[PDB]
Amino acid sequence: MWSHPQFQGIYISAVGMLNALGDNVDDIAQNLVLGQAPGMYERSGWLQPGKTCCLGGVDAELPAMPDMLSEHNSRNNRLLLAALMQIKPQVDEAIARHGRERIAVIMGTSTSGLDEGDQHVSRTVYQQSHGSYHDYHYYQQELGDPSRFLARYLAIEGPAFTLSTACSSSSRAIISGQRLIEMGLVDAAIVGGADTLSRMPINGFDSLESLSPTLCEPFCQDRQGITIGEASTLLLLTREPQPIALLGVGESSDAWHMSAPHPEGRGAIAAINMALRKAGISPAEIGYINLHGTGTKLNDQMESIVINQIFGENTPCSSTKYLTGHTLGAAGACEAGLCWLLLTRHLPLPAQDFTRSGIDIALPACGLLTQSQPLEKPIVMSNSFAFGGNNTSLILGVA
């Protein structure tokens, strides 16, 4: 018989950030427009043997780890706690409204407390007493510690886990939180991640001949590899409408090499296409692309070819890694956060830095910004291409 017929999109409600551009979203927004990162400078004691290294650091005094949570006392978790303090009222409202069981905590990291693990090995091997005041716990170095710490701190009883897919970790975290809300398992998700400076990735990238000792120059003639940075980003995803929508997400694997990209960018193309089709838009509707653009020979070549193929020559794009550094596991959420700031604060688009060696003349035209300009369409894309050929594309838009 007849019955009465009257008887979902994910949004970003809040973002907390720390990186080389600043200790809060106000300072980061200002410094992004100015093109200056106060935390980006040469630091001693990281790169062996006895070398200085340009690094993107967070120099801010970080909140103390409450002493009842000392098992989680890493700089990595104190950076996450600093980001959480920026969005604490919004997080408290979500928990109170939806309940502890209907919030997820999905983090990404490639380090966790790796620096604390490094200190523990060196201090133990050489019985060092004076240099170190740190109360080490194995939990600090576990890759699952970011989500474990935040869930314990906030009493979140919903899904809680950390993605560790190298440079795509914290962008995969955004995808997984978005899906857990779409699925109806939770109403909101705290997503993002943090990576902290450690001798292990700095000397590891040096061993790959992929570390620039001097500030990276993505897409430039003289580029000699990456500049490492650290960052924390937390985004509060929700089914409740907010000014900024997460319009599209895309993911792929190259199945090519553990550290070099697919030479034809097959995986990058698949991730970008998937994000555009989820958002229901054409390449022409993108106002800006925040590129991966690490400053390696192979990454920047592949990426210029992929953007030329999908977008042509007229879509504004740049890599901001000459400001933040390559924040590794934190890069996906850091750059999504910068894209959220461009949209919410109506900021001019950041130029590619061509002030040093100039553009690589062998790369195809792909719309690299030679100067700052206004955003002409209220939709932005951020891409991440990681070790193990792991690719993400995120699309943010004004709702």
Partner: protein, 238 residues
């Protein structure tokens, strides 16, 4: 709460690799591993390849390859609590001793090196994820697998693994913490053959890894079984 179908499996742990060994073990209480029992050789990898992967990674890639040879899969999720801890420890020792780091050792130290190496060896450009969540890496990682099924991936290869924990760490882990290598591979599909609900628990640092608690209860065939985690438990029903 989650519901899924599990349509195939492949696993290796000390003294356990053959179907008959796993089935006999599922009939025995309590569920236990003798770390002094030998591990079987990799069957899908050339020995040179297997011996260049770490103790847990080689098992995880081998079990994954076994299932990829039997099935068309759409996506892959690997889970591990400790990840590439042996490689991490080697590199932290290189830094302490002011020795050169092996670039291959560094590249393979990323948590997703197991799933990445599987996609390369199998020529399988499939969506891949790699999850860590402490004691609950297996149970929380099932949520990552369910997001991929939700997103339209019909058949998801799911592999939980650990490598050997270096003796260096034995004084900073719980006395109960398992320290041996193992891998459990499952083929997950959309369905309601199994349901799982999470509850509070007074237990932590289980003596048996979650994926092996799961395999024991699942193979044993009782209507209800429990997987213990970090002050939580996971109530499975058939």
């Amino acid at each position: 709460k989650l519901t899924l179908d599990i349509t195939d499996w492949q696993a290796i742990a000390p003294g356990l690799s053959l179907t008959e060994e796993w089935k006999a073990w599922s009939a025995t209480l309590p569920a236990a591993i003798d770390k002094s029992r030998p591990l079987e050789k990799c069957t899908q990898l050339p020995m040179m390849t297997a011996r260049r992967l770490s103790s847990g990674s080689r098992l995880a890639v081998d079990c994954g390859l076994s299932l990829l040879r039997r099935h068309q899969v759409d996506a892959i999720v690997y889970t591990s609590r400790h990840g590439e801890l042996e490689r991490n420890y080697q590199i932290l020792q290189n830094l302490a001793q002011q020795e050169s780091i092996s670039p291959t050792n560094f590249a393979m130290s990323v948590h997703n090196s197991s799933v990445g190496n599987l996609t390369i060896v199998a020529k399988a450009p499939l969506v891949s994820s790699s999850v860590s969540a402490g004691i609950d890496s297996f149970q929380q990682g099932l949520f990552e697998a369910l997001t991929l099924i939700h997103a339209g991936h019909r058949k998801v290869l799911f592999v939980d693994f650990e490598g050997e924990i270096p003796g260096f760490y034995h004084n900073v882990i719980d006395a109960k913490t398992p320290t041996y290598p193992f891998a459990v591979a499952l083929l997950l599909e959309q369905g309601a053959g199994l349901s799982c609900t999470k509850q509070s628990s007074m237990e932590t640092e289980p003596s048996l890894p979650q994926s092996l608690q799961f395999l024991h209860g699942w193979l044993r065939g009782e209507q209800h079984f429990v997987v213990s985690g970090d002050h939580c438990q996971w109530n499975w029903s058939r």
